[PDB]
Amino acid sequence: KVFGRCELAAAMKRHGLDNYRGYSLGNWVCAAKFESNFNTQATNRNTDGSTDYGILQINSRWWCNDGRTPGSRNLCNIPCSALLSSDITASVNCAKKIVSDGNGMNAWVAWRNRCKGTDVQAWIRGCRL
Ligand code: NA
């Protein structure tokens, strides 16, 4: 599913991401934009042979099982395929664990490089939330 910007903002808000670990909703929408362009089915292979899955490009090195990432963990206790669903519940629940891991949203290199310190409120501008 390719979410609309406000559509994804509403879904993230409903699932309690708005101000989760102190990160405003626009931070999450901005991260999703640059990770996946709001496409739940986004997959990208990392140099280390792990894969990033779904709207927030959650990595098989630590967070989900894809069966092809040697020596990896599955800390969200989910198949990586669950992160590609039209229903973002598994992505949001796993994102809550990631952002609680100690580096906050710096875990998402695209958030650090493209969203951090920017006017992230612009990402929820116009949305009926
Ligand atoms: Na894994």
PDB file of C-alpha atoms in Angstrom, residues 2-124:
ATOM      1  CA  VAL A   2       1.245   3.521  -0.884  1.00  0.00           C
ATOM      2  CA  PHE A   3      -0.157   5.739   1.917  1.00  0.00           C
ATOM      3  CA  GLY A   4      -1.083   9.354   1.433  1.00  0.00           C
ATOM      4  CA  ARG A   5       0.868  11.710   3.737  1.00  0.00           C
ATOM      5  CA  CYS A   6      -2.132  12.630   6.028  1.00  0.00           C
ATOM      6  CA  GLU A   7      -3.471   9.051   5.734  1.00  0.00           C
ATOM      7  CA  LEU A   8      -0.170   7.748   7.185  1.00  0.00           C
ATOM      8  CA  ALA A   9      -0.108  10.566   9.812  1.00  0.00           C
ATOM      9  CA  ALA A  10      -3.618   9.507  10.999  1.00  0.00           C
ATOM     10  CA  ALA A  11      -2.602   5.798  11.107  1.00  0.00           C
ATOM     11  CA  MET A  12       0.637   6.550  13.060  1.00  0.00           C
ATOM     12  CA  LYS A  13      -1.333   8.787  15.483  1.00  0.00           C
ATOM     13  CA  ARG A  14      -4.036   6.124  16.052  1.00  0.00           C
ATOM     14  CA  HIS A  15      -1.217   3.604  16.825  1.00  0.00           C
ATOM     15  CA  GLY A  16       0.311   6.025  19.447  1.00  0.00           C
ATOM     16  CA  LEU A  17       3.494   7.131  17.592  1.00  0.00           C
ATOM     17  CA  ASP A  18       2.673  10.891  18.036  1.00  0.00           C
ATOM     18  CA  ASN A  19       5.177  12.117  20.713  1.00  0.00           C
ATOM     19  CA  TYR A  20       6.320   8.510  21.393  1.00  0.00           C
ATOM     20  CA  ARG A  21       9.705   8.744  23.219  1.00  0.00           C
ATOM     21  CA  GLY A  22       9.193  12.523  22.696  1.00  0.00           C
ATOM     22  CA  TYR A  23       9.161  12.409  18.849  1.00  0.00           C
ATOM     23  CA  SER A  24       6.352  14.524  17.328  1.00  0.00           C
ATOM     24  CA  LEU A  25       4.195  12.962  14.596  1.00  0.00           C
ATOM     25  CA  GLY A  26       5.969  14.965  11.859  1.00  0.00           C
ATOM     26  CA  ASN A  27       9.288  13.247  12.757  1.00  0.00           C
ATOM     27  CA  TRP A  28       7.677   9.823  12.049  1.00  0.00           C
ATOM     28  CA  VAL A  29       6.012  10.970   8.798  1.00  0.00           C
ATOM     29  CA  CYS A  30       9.296  12.586   7.607  1.00  0.00           C
ATOM     30  CA  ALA A  31      11.195   9.345   8.454  1.00  0.00           C
ATOM     31  CA  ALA A  32       8.597   7.286   6.528  1.00  0.00           C
ATOM     32  CA  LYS A  33       8.797   9.645   3.508  1.00  0.00           C
ATOM     33  CA  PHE A  34      12.583   9.291   3.136  1.00  0.00           C
ATOM     34  CA  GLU A  35      12.748   5.584   4.137  1.00  0.00           C
ATOM     35  CA  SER A  36       9.924   4.245   1.927  1.00  0.00           C
ATOM     36  CA  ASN A  37       8.095   7.155   0.156  1.00  0.00           C
ATOM     37  CA  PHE A  38       5.141   5.866   2.274  1.00  0.00           C
ATOM     38  CA  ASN A  39       5.164   2.446   0.480  1.00  0.00           C
ATOM     39  CA  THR A  40       4.503  -0.492   2.907  1.00  0.00           C
ATOM     40  CA  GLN A  41       6.059  -2.909   0.358  1.00  0.00           C
ATOM     41  CA  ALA A  42       9.492  -1.074   0.212  1.00  0.00           C
ATOM     42  CA  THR A  43      12.489  -3.461   0.612  1.00  0.00           C
ATOM     43  CA  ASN A  44      16.186  -2.474   0.354  1.00  0.00           C
ATOM     44  CA  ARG A  45      19.283  -4.733   0.708  1.00  0.00           C
ATOM     45  CA  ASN A  46      22.011  -3.415   3.057  1.00  0.00           C
ATOM     46  CA  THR A  47      25.772  -3.859   2.367  1.00  0.00           C
ATOM     47  CA  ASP A  48      26.057  -6.356   5.305  1.00  0.00           C
ATOM     48  CA  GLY A  49      23.406  -8.590   3.545  1.00  0.00           C
ATOM     49  CA  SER A  50      20.592  -7.631   5.940  1.00  0.00           C
ATOM     50  CA  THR A  51      17.379  -6.163   4.418  1.00  0.00           C
ATOM     51  CA  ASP A  52      15.217  -3.191   5.451  1.00  0.00           C
ATOM     52  CA  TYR A  53      11.429  -3.740   5.271  1.00  0.00           C
ATOM     53  CA  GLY A  54       8.316  -1.539   5.029  1.00  0.00           C
ATOM     54  CA  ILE A  55       7.311   2.104   5.693  1.00  0.00           C
ATOM     55  CA  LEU A  56      10.108   2.583   8.277  1.00  0.00           C
ATOM     56  CA  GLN A  57      12.766   0.295   6.644  1.00  0.00           C
ATOM     57  CA  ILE A  58      13.208  -1.915   9.714  1.00  0.00           C
ATOM     58  CA  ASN A  59      16.411  -3.983   9.430  1.00  0.00           C
ATOM     59  CA  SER A  60      16.555  -7.847   9.638  1.00  0.00           C
ATOM     60  CA  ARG A  61      20.043  -7.519  11.341  1.00  0.00           C
ATOM     61  CA  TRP A  62      18.205  -6.924  14.711  1.00  0.00           C
ATOM     62  CA  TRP A  63      14.414  -6.577  14.528  1.00  0.00           C
ATOM     63  CA  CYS A  64      12.706  -9.166  12.280  1.00  0.00           C
ATOM     64  CA  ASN A  65      13.330 -12.660  10.900  1.00  0.00           C
ATOM     65  CA  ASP A  66      13.762 -13.047   7.108  1.00  0.00           C
ATOM     66  CA  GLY A  67      15.706 -16.348   7.355  1.00  0.00           C
ATOM     67  CA  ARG A  68      18.615 -14.966   5.236  1.00  0.00           C
ATOM     68  CA  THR A  69      20.530 -12.656   7.645  1.00  0.00           C
ATOM     69  CA  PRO A  70      23.250 -14.793   9.285  1.00  0.00           C
ATOM     70  CA  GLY A  71      23.926 -14.131  12.986  1.00  0.00           C
ATOM     71  CA  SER A  72      20.991 -11.671  13.118  1.00  0.00           C
ATOM     72  CA  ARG A  73      18.347 -11.204  15.857  1.00  0.00           C
ATOM     73  CA  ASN A  74      14.503 -10.929  15.707  1.00  0.00           C
ATOM     74  CA  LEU A  75      13.883  -8.534  18.630  1.00  0.00           C
ATOM     75  CA  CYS A  76      10.346  -7.585  17.383  1.00  0.00           C
ATOM     76  CA  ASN A  77       9.548 -11.367  17.245  1.00  0.00           C
ATOM     77  CA  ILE A  78       8.011 -11.028  13.730  1.00  0.00           C
ATOM     78  CA  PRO A  79       8.678 -12.274  10.201  1.00  0.00           C
ATOM     79  CA  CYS A  80      10.064  -9.322   8.150  1.00  0.00           C
ATOM     80  CA  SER A  81       7.168  -9.943   5.667  1.00  0.00           C
ATOM     81  CA  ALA A  82       4.732  -8.653   8.419  1.00  0.00           C
ATOM     82  CA  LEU A  83       6.467  -5.251   7.965  1.00  0.00           C
ATOM     83  CA  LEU A  84       5.191  -5.068   4.319  1.00  0.00           C
ATOM     84  CA  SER A  85       1.446  -5.370   5.174  1.00  0.00           C
ATOM     85  CA  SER A  86      -1.123  -2.644   4.266  1.00  0.00           C
ATOM     86  CA  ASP A  87      -1.785  -2.662   8.066  1.00  0.00           C
ATOM     87  CA  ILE A  88       1.098  -0.764   9.745  1.00  0.00           C
ATOM     88  CA  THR A  89       0.480  -2.247  13.262  1.00  0.00           C
ATOM     89  CA  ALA A  90       3.609  -4.529  13.123  1.00  0.00           C
ATOM     90  CA  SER A  91       5.820  -1.677  11.749  1.00  0.00           C
ATOM     91  CA  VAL A  92       4.635   0.750  14.467  1.00  0.00           C
ATOM     92  CA  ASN A  93       4.994  -1.773  17.351  1.00  0.00           C
ATOM     93  CA  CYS A  94       8.526  -2.691  16.167  1.00  0.00           C
ATOM     94  CA  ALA A  95       9.403   1.053  15.633  1.00  0.00           C
ATOM     95  CA  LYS A  96       8.415   1.681  19.303  1.00  0.00           C
ATOM     96  CA  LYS A  97      11.034  -0.929  20.395  1.00  0.00           C
ATOM     97  CA  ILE A  98      13.707   0.501  18.033  1.00  0.00           C
ATOM     98  CA  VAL A  99      13.266   4.135  19.157  1.00  0.00           C
ATOM     99  CA  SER A 100      13.405   2.938  22.844  1.00  0.00           C
ATOM    100  CA  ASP A 101      16.835   1.173  22.241  1.00  0.00           C
ATOM    101  CA  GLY A 102      18.818   4.277  23.405  1.00  0.00           C
ATOM    102  CA  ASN A 103      19.694   6.379  20.297  1.00  0.00           C
ATOM    103  CA  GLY A 104      16.063   7.480  19.738  1.00  0.00           C
ATOM    104  CA  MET A 105      15.315   8.171  16.049  1.00  0.00           C
ATOM    105  CA  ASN A 106      19.072   8.317  15.148  1.00  0.00           C
ATOM    106  CA  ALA A 107      18.485   4.549  14.528  1.00  0.00           C
ATOM    107  CA  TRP A 108      16.967   5.729  11.198  1.00  0.00           C
ATOM    108  CA  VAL A 109      20.034   7.185   9.383  1.00  0.00           C
ATOM    109  CA  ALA A 110      17.619   8.922   6.864  1.00  0.00           C
ATOM    110  CA  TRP A 111      15.822  10.556   9.826  1.00  0.00           C
ATOM    111  CA  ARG A 112      19.192  11.843  11.196  1.00  0.00           C
ATOM    112  CA  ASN A 113      20.378  13.012   7.759  1.00  0.00           C
ATOM    113  CA  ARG A 114      17.091  14.436   6.324  1.00  0.00           C
ATOM    114  CA  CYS A 115      14.552  15.103   9.151  1.00  0.00           C
ATOM    115  CA  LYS A 116      16.457  15.836  12.377  1.00  0.00           C
ATOM    116  CA  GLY A 117      16.420  19.563  13.225  1.00  0.00           C
ATOM    117  CA  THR A 118      14.180  20.429  10.225  1.00  0.00           C
ATOM    118  CA  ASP A 119      10.645  21.872  10.312  1.00  0.00           C
ATOM    119  CA  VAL A 120       9.074  18.386  10.636  1.00  0.00           C
ATOM    120  CA  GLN A 121       5.647  19.920  11.512  1.00  0.00           C
ATOM    121  CA  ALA A 122       5.346  20.700   7.733  1.00  0.00           C
ATOM    122  CA  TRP A 123       4.811  16.901   7.212  1.00  0.00           C
ATOM    123  CA  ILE A 124       1.440  17.016   9.077  1.00  0.00           C
TER     124      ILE A 124
END
